[PDB]
Amino acid sequence: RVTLQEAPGTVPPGRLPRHREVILLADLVDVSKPGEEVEVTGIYKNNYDGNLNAKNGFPVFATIIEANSIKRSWTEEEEREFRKISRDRGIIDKIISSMAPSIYGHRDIKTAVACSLFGGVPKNVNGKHSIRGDINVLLLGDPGTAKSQILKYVEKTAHRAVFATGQGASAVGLTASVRKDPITKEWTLEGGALVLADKGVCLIDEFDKMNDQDRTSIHEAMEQQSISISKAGIVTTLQARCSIIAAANPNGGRYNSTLPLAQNVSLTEPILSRFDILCVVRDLVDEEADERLATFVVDSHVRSHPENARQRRLQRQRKKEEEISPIPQELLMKYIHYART
Amino acid sequence: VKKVDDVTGEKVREAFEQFLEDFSKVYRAQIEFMKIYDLNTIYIDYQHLSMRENGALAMAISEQYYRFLPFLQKGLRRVVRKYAPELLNTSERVFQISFFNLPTVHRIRDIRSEKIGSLLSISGTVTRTSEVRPELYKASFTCDMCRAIVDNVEQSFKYTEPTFCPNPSCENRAFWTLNVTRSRFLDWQKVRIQENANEIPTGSMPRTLDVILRGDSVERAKPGDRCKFTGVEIVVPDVTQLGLPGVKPSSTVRDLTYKISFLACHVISIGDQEVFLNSLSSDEINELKEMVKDEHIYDKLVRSIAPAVFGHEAVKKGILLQMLGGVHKSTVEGIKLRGDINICVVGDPSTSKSQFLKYVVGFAPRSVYTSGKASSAAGLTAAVVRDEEGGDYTIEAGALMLADNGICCIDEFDKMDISDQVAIHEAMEQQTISIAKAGIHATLNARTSILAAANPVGGRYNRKLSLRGNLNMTAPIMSRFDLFFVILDDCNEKIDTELASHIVDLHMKPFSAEQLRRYIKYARTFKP
Amino acid sequence: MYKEKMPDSQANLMDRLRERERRSAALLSQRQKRYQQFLAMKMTQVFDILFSLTRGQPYTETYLSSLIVDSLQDSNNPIGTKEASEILAGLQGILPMDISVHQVDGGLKVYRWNSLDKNRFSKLL
Amino acid sequence: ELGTSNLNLDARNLLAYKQTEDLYHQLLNYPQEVISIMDQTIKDCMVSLIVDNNLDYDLDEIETKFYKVRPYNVGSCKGMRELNPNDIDKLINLKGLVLRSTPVIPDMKVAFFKCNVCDHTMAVEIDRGVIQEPARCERIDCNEPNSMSLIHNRCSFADKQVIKLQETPDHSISLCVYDELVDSCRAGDRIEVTGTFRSIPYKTYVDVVHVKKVITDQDLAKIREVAAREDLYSLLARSIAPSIYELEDVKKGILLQLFGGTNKTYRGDINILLCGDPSTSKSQILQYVHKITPRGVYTSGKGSSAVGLTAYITRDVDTKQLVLESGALVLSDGGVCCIDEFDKMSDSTRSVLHEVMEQQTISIAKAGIITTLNARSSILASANPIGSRYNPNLPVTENIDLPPPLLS
Ligand SMILES: Nc1ncnc2c1ncn2[C@@H]1O[C@H](COP(=O)(O)OP(=O)(O)O)[C@@H](O)[C@H]1O
Ligand SMILES: Nc1ncnc2c1ncn2[C@@H]1O[C@H](COP(=O)(O)OP(=O)(O)O)[C@@H](O)[C@H]1O
Ligand SMILES: Nc1ncnc2c1ncn2[C@@H]1O[C@H](COP(=O)(O)OP(=O)(O)O)[C@@H](O)[C@H]1O
Ligand SMILES: [Zn+2]
Ligand SMILES: [Zn+2]
């Protein structure tokens, strides 16, 4: 008996993750393991007959799916369209300019987002040695610098993204949790945020303000891409291949440009070591810088504001994408997916 | 062998079918609409039901609704075979009726055993919901001794095997085979609603109730919403009555315990200019218009916020603007923009600031009042509580989730701990709550406008120093508050004489307070 | 903006405020009359509450006015509690034939309505 | 004239007349029978006054319906704990404070049976808590045994509620109410009980028959004499505290606390801080104040906490609504409380007083609980100066260890 849960990026706004139960029979066992994303075809039947008729008001049952076949893929029209853009001279600056186009400036930060979305090569060197492939990014700076809204963009762009907040997340809720099987009464383990984000990205907001213990469990994930647990007789390790993008604030809420970074934050060299790119942000004052940034933002609220009808309005959206982005956003999501595969 | 006929039910159904064939035939157009769109449930307005026979048809239907339901079901499903027989087909005759638009909206405070079996509508804040399940609406069995089949075996609020084998050639009883294909099932869901905050007086405590949803009306209940239901009250057996004082009746031994529950057939949630405008009459339109199309309304409405509090004319503008939060926008890139406004107020311990919070929580459509030291991180944002009917956790609405799309008020803000001031940060700007704790990973809507009050670090305003040093609030929290007021007091005689003059009038004793909510319910629609 | 640039009126500006002053009383009365029409029309969608689900008669006006509010009127056009008292007090006046409510010791008590054609009497408005 | 369904009989008239007291002693063990007779008597009295006296003609609803009578001011018994096993089922009169209320619990009065093979319906009513299942269908043709079936939601029910009372005999007792008496008693109500002491095979409870929601002219003459005499204030100071010498203003101070201001809706809860030197009889006062005043609560700031003063609030599985464990401050609702060692109160506890002394309410918003309470009370506070003695060489606001927001 295996539980299937909605994909992390597909949960509708403001609802808990809908999930069902799947019945694997006849050598269809062990086809998938926690963290894997699968598609399955089966029969939708009802079998929960028992005390539910009386223990809850009126006779009711529960639904299951009896799986028949399961699978854990591009047409020519897609790849042929990719290669047209691929041959364009200087494509790198096209992708970077398309990273959240509605944010002005911060190009040396958008490149970190662009580089982390594509990732590297998870080189399992000669098998006996392993190196992580995904790029870790830490965003640090003064309030009012969009260190969080970018993480509200990586969620909507990466294939699989899990979002978390500093004080709203617990150590058990991130790595793994412990449960008892309702059928066999055995100790079972349930995956957390990092386990979900396997082959994806993990987004932590207000990384500094969380308690030390909640921040401590992250150490293994950022280098091993795995969760190691030993609780209630469970001794195992899961797969947690996911890049981590973290936003934080300096001590006192303002960045002291006259002091080193190691002194400006409450974190320490170990935690900073697991990161690849650190994006220090200064909210310094300048009329020319302010005029360019403000005239960009004031136009952003003009466009994001509301105002074959399907085709006509879909044309309008991609028209505004062309106003601000050299790449249509739907293709870029696919283009990142194609590159990663 | 002739069974007893309900002459009142037959009269009702005859009046029921006659009403269906004559009401103008929009309901039959809906019947055809259901056939076109493959729909299960038809919906009927109660006021449409109450405009025949001077409404006496509805009255008999209302006060004894649970009894008369099959007659109306027969009344309609005969009509469907008359005009849309394809709805009877399968790949069988599932059919539902869901009424709505009741005049009375009874409170959880007002449940009486007299109301059992009658049709009533209630409103209550949701706290927990259950996952949808299929309900055995009607079953069928095949015999075990012989192989005869028994169809249309209804299960009224309990599991019920057939009491005989229909053919006299067989003697089978209490031994049957359950069909899972010719039988039929319907959706089912439980909703745990709570009495609204504005219903319970101070010192009193909120009542709780469990409400049942079935059919396509399921899943239209989300935690933290002010839902509105329509249905009938039905009692179910209870197991917690043991140990109570008083003589308890017995059956002969068998127990006869009961507890009250409410069954709802329709679901709706209380909340674009022309959509809103046509829902009001001309007198309503003119009354609402007089507060908009007057050349000085913005001046007038500021003077209509907490009229008991004297002075502080800046905060009366600030709160009024907070009460009309800006336009939410979504980027073509996918990013969303906040529309609500956060406000902080700081003053000396003599400057009346708690009165503003009391006024806001007593006036706002949705509002929550809390204190600095009393509140905590989990109580404000979200509560991870183990759920009933299973071994898995479930969220419980914190202070911020309650009064969502409203104003949240906190008193003595400077007294709050930093570690539990942090938890408000995400809700203040992103209007969302992110949870990853023990098997829960959802993101919850937290569109709330935080209003806070606090005092300087030294009790009094240290007027020797500057504004930079008198506040312990760090830079991040200060940046988020769109408005930030520090009000001070001095020994000016001309002010104190007037101030003392009218505060004594409190102990001596433009637009009305009801008018402001009516105006705001219209203003919140415009999107400049 | 700066639209009022050249309204070079005579001494009639004193007569200008006579129009502001002398006519304001009638408009205030009309606004009062509109509220009466506002209240006298809402009772049409109020007595359906009474007709539908109340046949016993222990109810005092305090409870009912607290259920005129927090009810079907808790919608796109809310109503006030003191208005709800005025709404319920107007019912006896507009329909003396079916309602006869008297002060008991303090406050009012409401009995089971005899009821008739619910809205035909609205012509008195 | 009344459209009511019952009468709250002025039972104090029973001790005001001779033969009625004789009835009371006779009625002490048989209250139900007379009340049942009075119900028919009330209907007969109504019918006789309506149509037999020809003063009225609206009789149809009254004749068909049923009435009740409730004596409310019967002479009190010998207290709760003094009752005896034979005193069970006897009429009693008690007093106390209501704490908690259970939700509406319906109970069976009429059972609805339908024959499962011929649809015939019977109306069966319970007598003395007994359900009688019909054995066969009553129709002449259909006579199948055990064919009668019960429909849960076609029956008739009556409201049953359990209200919890803190009883002070003339300990807490769980009361019981029925029909219109339910939800008439709510949390915090001041209550006098006229009902039946009950313990049945054994828990102590009272089947409340009626509930009450709440001196000589020579005393008036005595009051006016002190009211008229010119040394009124001088006499009060001279007589309030014999052990404490002089302190005319302190006599006027605490006395004005006990008199209190007027309450309008703005309360008159006067509060006083004694900043005296740590050797002047002030504990000798507040200890004495706790006794002379109408019964309050004596508390020490050092030995009290925020939970100790306010409450502990939690949910209940059975009641499905919030329950309160009243703290020291709430228990003094409407009265006077003394807070010694006010200078030693914990900061978290001191934070409570801000809302208490501004709105007399306390708002709590924690895990699973969001509610506000009421703790309207008067506070008498005594506080030693900072150090071993008062130091006038320092400003007065520096001799007191209280913040300006609380000291003001
Ligand atoms: N470079 C920028 N371009 C456009 N908008 C910006 C920029 N920096 C900040 N903002 C605006 O300021 C807000 C910052 O929100 P947030 O990301 O929570 O700030 P923080 O950096 O404190 O996390 C966003 O709503 C965004 O619209
Ligand atoms: N402008 C005003 N109008 C009416 N009352 C006032 C005004 N200013 C002060 N007060 C009175 O003074 C008191 C000030 O208390 P407050 O400042 O609210 O205490 P806290 O600091 O605990 O909120 C209030 O009870 C209020 O009645
Ligand atoms: N003015 C006074 N009248 C009566 N007794 C006094 C007076 N001053 C001091 N005492 C006595 O001194 C002792 C000190 O008690 P008190 O001052 O009430 O509290 P504390 O011991 O905390 O100072 C008491 O026993 C009291 O009898
Ligand atoms: Zn058979
Ligand atoms: Zn029969």
DSSP codes, B94-157: --EEEEE--S-EE-GGG--GGGBTSEEEEEEEEEEE---EEEEEEEEEEESSS--EEEEEE-SS
B331 occurs within a structural domain: yes
Q: Are D385 and D329 in contact (CB under 8 A)?
A: no
Residue D204 marked in a binding site: no
Burial of A218 (0-12, 13-18, 19+ CB in 10 A): buried
Angle at which helices B65-83 and B56-63 cross, to 10°: 120
| Resolution of the experimentally solved model in angstroms | 3.4
First CA to last CA distance, chain D = 57
Chain B residues with beta carbon closer than 8 angstroms to that of C55: 63
Pocket test for ligand 3, best of D240, D284, D287, D302 (most atoms within 8 A of CB): D284
| Helix-, strand-, coil-residue percentages of chain B, each rounded to 5 | 30, 25, 40
Report the C-alpha gap between D22 and D14 in whole angstroms.
9
β-sheet bridge partners, residue D71? D9
Burial label, A227 (beta-carbon count in 10 A; 0-12, 13-18, 19+): buried
Token look-up 């929009």 returns: B26
Which residues have C-beta within 8 Å of that of residue A269, sequence separation ≥ 6? A262
Helix (H) or strand (E) holding A69: strand A63-71
- The set of residues, in sequence order, having a beta carbon less than 8 Å from that of A316 and lying 6+ positions away, is none
Cβ burial, residue D176 (10 Å; 0-12/13-18/19+) = buried
A204, C108, D20, A1: which is closest to B426 by C-alpha?
A: A204
With beta carbons under 8 A apart, name residues in chain C contacting D159. Answer: none
| Number of domains chain B contains | 4
Chain breaks in chain A (C to N over 2.5 A) after: 72, 307
- The residue among A5, A14, A330 whose CA lies nearest residue A157 is A330
HSE, side-chain direction, 13 A CA sphere, residue B286: 11
Whether C111 sits inside 8 A of D180 (CB atoms) is: no
Quick one: DSSP state of residue B242? Answer: T
HSE, CB side, 13 Å, CA atoms: give it for residue B399: 31
Q: At B110, list the tokens.
A: 């007002």
Q: Which helix (H) or strand (E) holds B57?
A: helix B56-63
Task: Determine whether the shortest distance from the Cβ of A283 to ligand 1 is under 6 A.
Answer: no
Residue B330 DSSP class: E
- Alpha carbon distance D226, B108 (integer Å): 54
Please check whether residues A122 and A41 belong to one and the same domain: no
Rounded-to-integer distance, Cα D322 and Cα D313, Å: 7
End-to-end CA distance of chain A: 30
Neighbours of chain A (3+ CB pairs under 8 A): B
A48 shares its domain with A138: no
**Chain B interface disruption, residue of C4, C38, C76, C117, most B CBs within 10 A:** C76
CA distance B118 to B96: 18
Question: Are A91 and A218 members of one domain?
Answer: yes
Q: Which of D321, D351, D373 shows the shortest C-beta gap to B373?
A: D351
Q: Could you tell me the residue range of the domain that residue B125 belongs to?
A: 105-133+187-238+257-271
In a mutational test of the pocket of ligand 2, which residue from B355, B414, B485, B508 has the highest number of ligand atoms less than 8 Å from its CB? Answer: B355
Angle, alpha carbons B515-B519-B522 (nearest 5°): 150
Give the pair of three-digit tokens for residue B130.
Answer: 């259950």
Same domain for B228 and B206, yes or no, is yes
CATH number at residue A260: 3.40.50.300
Residues A51 and A170 in one domain: no
- Residue C26, token pair as written in the block: 């009638």
For A160, other C-beta atoms within 10 Å of its C-beta total 19
| Pairing, β D163-167 against β D172-178 | antiparallel
Among residues B169, B186, B203, the one where a domain terminates is B186
Verify whether the Cβ–Cβ distance B437 to A173 is below 8 Å.
yes
For residue B251, being part of any structural domain is answered with: no
Domain end: A72, A102, A121, which one? A72
Angle at B310 between CA B306 and CA B311, to 5 degrees: 105
For CA atoms D142, D143, D148, D154, the dihedral sign is positive
Which are the contacts of D130, defined by CB distance < 8 A and separation ≥ 6?
B249, B250, B252
Same domain, B266 and B296: no
CA–CA dist B81, B6 (Å, integer): 23
Structure tokens belonging to residue B461: 């305003």
Helix (H) or strand (E) holding B452: strand B448-454
Short-list B386, B205, B109, CA closest to D321 = B205
Domain boundary (A72, A97, A112) is at A72
Q: Is C106 left (phi over 0), alpha (psi -120 to 50) or beta?
A: beta
SS3 content of chain C, % helix, strand, coil (to 5): 55, 5, 45
Cβ contacts of B226 within 8 Å, gap of 6 or more: B123, B124, B125, B196, B269, B270, B366
Judge if A157 and A247 occupy the same domain. Answer: yes
Give the DSSP letter string of B365-414. SSEEEEETTT--HHHHSEEEEEPTTSSSEEEEE-TTTTTTTEEEEEESGG
Rounded Cα gap, residues B117 and C38, in angstroms: 36
Task: Give the three-class secondary structure for B38.
Answer: coil
Q: Which chains touch B (3 or more CB pairs under 8 A)?
A: A, C, D
Q: Cα separation of D66 and D43, whole Å? A: 8
State whether B30 and B167 are in the same domain: no
Instruction: Tell me the angle at which helices B65-83 and B7-22 cross, rounded to the nearest 10 degrees.
Output: 50
Rounded distance between C-alpha atoms, residue B19 and residue D398, angstroms = 84
* Whether residue B318 is found in the same domain as residue B358: yes
What is the spatial distance between Cα B290 and Cα C33, in angstroms, rounded to a whole number? 14
Place of tokens 């009639």: C12
CB of D376 closer than 8 Å to CB of D269: yes
Contacts of B425 (CB under 8 A, 6+ apart): A206, A209, B476, B477, B480
B334-338 contacts, C-beta under 8 A, 24 or more apart: B334/A153, B334/A156, B334/A157, B334/A329, B335/A100, B335/A102, B335/A149, B335/A152, B335/A153, B335/A156, B335/A304, B336/A152, B336/B431, B337/A301, B337/A304, B338/B429, B338/B430, B338/B431
Neighbour count for residue A108 (Cβ, 10 Å):
12
Task: Show the tokens assigned to B315.
Answer: 């905060």
Structure tokens at A86: 């691929």
Tokens of A247: 């936003």
- Taking the C-alpha atoms of residue B277 and residue B275, their distance in angstroms, rounded to an integer, is 6
Write the burial class of residue D263 (CB in 10 Å: 0-12 exposed, 13-18 middle, 19+ buried). Answer: exposed
The total of structural domains in chain A comes to 2
B163 lines ligand 2 (CB under 6 A): no
Q: Which of B397, B410, B342, B400 minimizes the C-alpha distance to B366?
A: B400
Residue nearest to atom 27 of ligand 1 (CA): A146
If asked whether residues B182 and B197 sit together in one domain, one would say: no
B228 shares its domain with B149: no
Q: How many CB atoms sit inside 10 A of residue C59's CB?
A: 16
Task: Report the candidate in D100, D85, D72, D78 with the shortest Cα–Cα distance to residue D10.
Answer: D72
In order of A16, A175, A321, B148, D61, the CA distances from A170 in angstroms are: 18, 9, 38, 60, 66
Give distance in angstroms: CA of D358 to centre of ligand 2.
8
Residue B254: is it exposed, middle or buried by C-beta count within 10 angstroms (0-12/13-18/19+)? exposed
Residue among B399, B433, B418, B409 nearest B476 (CA): B418
Question: Is some CB atom of chain B closer than 8 A to the CB atom of A264?
Answer: no
Q: Are A157 and A117 in contact (CB under 8 A)?
A: yes
**Is D281 known as a binding-site position?**
yes
Nearest CA in chain B to A98: B333
Question: Do B266 and B288 reside in the same domain of the chain?
Answer: no
B163 Cα–ligand 4 center, Å: 11
Q: Do C52 and B59 touch (CB under 8 A)?
A: yes
Using alpha carbons, list the distances in angstroms from residue A84 to A319, A336, B517.
Answer: 20, 15, 58
Residue B246 inside a domain? The answer is no
Structure tokens given for D36: 């049942």
Integer Cα distance of B407 and B320 in angstroms:
11
Q: Are residues B426 and B469 in the same domain?
A: yes
Structure tokens at A174: 């991130």
Residue appearing with tokens 């048989």: D30
Instruction: Annotate chain D with three-state secondary structure.
Output: CCCCCEEEECCHHHHHCHHHHHHHHHHCCCHHHHHHHHHHHHHHHHHHHHHHCCCCCCCHHHHHCCCEEEECCCCCCCCCCCCCHHHCCCEEEEEEEEEEECCCEEEEEEEEEEECCCCCEEEEECCCCEECCCCECCCCCCCCECCEEECHHHCEEEEEECEEEEECCCCEEEEEEEHHHCCCCCCCCEEEEEEEEECCCCCCEEEEEEEEECCCHHHHHHHHHHHHCCCHHHHHHHHHCCCCCCCHHHHHHHHHHHHCCCCCCCCCCCCEEECCCCCCCCHHHHHHHHHHCCCCEEEECCCCCHHHHCEEEECCCCCCECEEEECHHHHCCCCEEEEECHHHCCHHHHHHHHHHHHHCEEEEEECCEEEEEECCCEEEEECCCCCCCCCCCCCHHHHCCCCHHHHC
D212 is in an annotated binding site: no
Structural tokens at position B440: 């829960």
Same domain flag for B96 and B212: no
Query: Two tokens at B119?
Result: 């049709």
For tokens 């009668």, the residue is: D148
As a whole number of angstroms, the distance between CA B148 and CA B170 comes to: 9
Residue nearest to atom 23 of ligand 2 (CA): B354
Q: Are residues B378 and B514 in the same domain?
A: yes
* Distance, CA of C61 to CA of C52 (rounded, Å): 17
Indicate if ligand 1 lies below 6 Å from the C-beta of A145.
yes
Cα torsion C35, C39, C41, C47 to 10°: value is 180
* 8 Å CB contact between B372 and B346: no
Q: Is residue B245 part of a domain?
A: no
How far is A325 from D268, CA to CA, in rounded Å? 69
DSSP 8-class letter at B484: E
C-alpha dist (Å) from residue B50 to B59, B266, C47, C53, C117:
8, 18, 13, 13, 12
Tell me the CA distances in angstroms from A125 to A122, A131, A341, B177, D270, one per residue in order. 9, 7, 19, 62, 81
Decide whether any atom of ligand 1 lies within 6 Å of the A17 Cβ.
no
Q: Is A297 in the pocket of ligand 1 (CB under 6 A)?
A: yes
Question: Of A72, A90, A106, which residue sits at a domain end?
Answer: A72
Answer yes or no: is B247 within a domain.
no
CA distance linking residue B110 with residue B121, whole number of Å: 12
- Indicate if A23 and A145 belong to the same structural domain: no
* Same domain assignment for residues B494 and B474: yes
Name the nearest CA neighbour of B50 among C27, C52, A155, D334: C52
User: C50 phi and psi, to 5 degrees?
Assistant: -65, -45
Q: Are residues A249 and A148 in the same domain?
A: yes
Q: Do D180 and C57 touch (CB under 8 A)?
A: no
Whether residue D154 contacts residue B117, with contact meaning beta carbons closer than 8 Å, is answered with yes
User: CA angle, corner B368, sides to B365 and B370, nearest 5?
Assistant: 155
Task: Name the amino acid, one letter, at D124.
Answer: V
Instruction: Give B253's contacts in chain D (Cβ within 8 Å).
Output: none
- Distance, in Å, from the CA atom of A97 to the CA atom of A102, rounded to the nearest integer, reads 10
- Shared domain for A58 and A119, answered yes or no, is no
In the DSSP assignment, the letter for residue C60 is B
Same domain (yes/no): A62, A188: no
Q: Is residue B319 part of a domain?
A: yes
**B390 within a domain of the structure (yes/no):** yes
The answer to whether B350 is a known ligand-binding residue is yes
Task: Compute the half-sphere exposure of residue B134: CA atoms within 13 Å on the CB side of its CA.
Answer: 17
- A315 — contact with chain B (CB < 8 Å)? no
Q: B384: buried, middle or exposed (CB in 10 Å: 19+, 13-18, 0-12)?
A: middle
The DSSP secondary-structure symbol of A274 reads: T
* Cβ neighbours of residue B403 closer than 8 Å, sequence gap 6 or more: B197, B364, B366, B367, B368, B448
Q: Dihedral (C-alpha) B465, B467, B472, B476: value to the nearest 10 degrees?
A: -150
Give ∠ CA B433-B436-B441 in degrees, rounded to 5: 80
Q: Is residue A70 in contact with ligand 1, taking CB distance under 6 Å?
A: no
Place of tokens 């139960």: A21
B214 assigned to some structural domain = yes
Give the nearest ligand 1 atom to A139 CA: 21
Ligand 2 atom nearest to CA at B312: 1
Taking Cα atoms as reference points, which of B121, B325, B127 lies closest to residue B208?
B127
Atom of ligand 1 nearest to the CA of A249: 22
Q: Taking CA B370 as the corner, what is the angle to CA B364 and CA B373, rounded to the nearest 5 degrees? A: 160
Judge whether B293 and B486 are in contact, CB under 8 Å: no
Picking from B69, B79, B93, B88, the residue whose alpha carbon sits closest to that of residue B12 is B69
Say if residues A24 and A31 touch (Cβ distance below 8 Å): yes
Ligand 4 (ion): residues with CB under 5 Å are B 143, 145-146, 148, 165, 170, 172
Q: Quick one: how many helices (H) and strands (E) in chain C?
A: 5, 0
Domain with A306, as residue range(s), is 73-341
Angle between helices C81-94 and C24-42 (to 10 degrees): 80
List the 166-225 stretch of A: residues with Cβ below 8 A of B.
166-170, 172-174, 177, 179-180, 182, 190, 192-193, 196, 205-206, 209, 211
> Which tokens is D97 given?
């404070």
Q: Which long-range contacts (CB under 8 A, 24 or more apart) does B159-168 make?
A: B159/A53, B159/A54, B159/A59, B163/D116, B163/D117, B164/D117
CA distance to A144, D328, D343, D387, per residue, from D339 (Å): 49, 10, 10, 20
C-alpha A182/C-alpha A188 separation (Å) is: 10
> Looking at the DSSP assignment, which residues form a beta bridge with residue A229?
A236
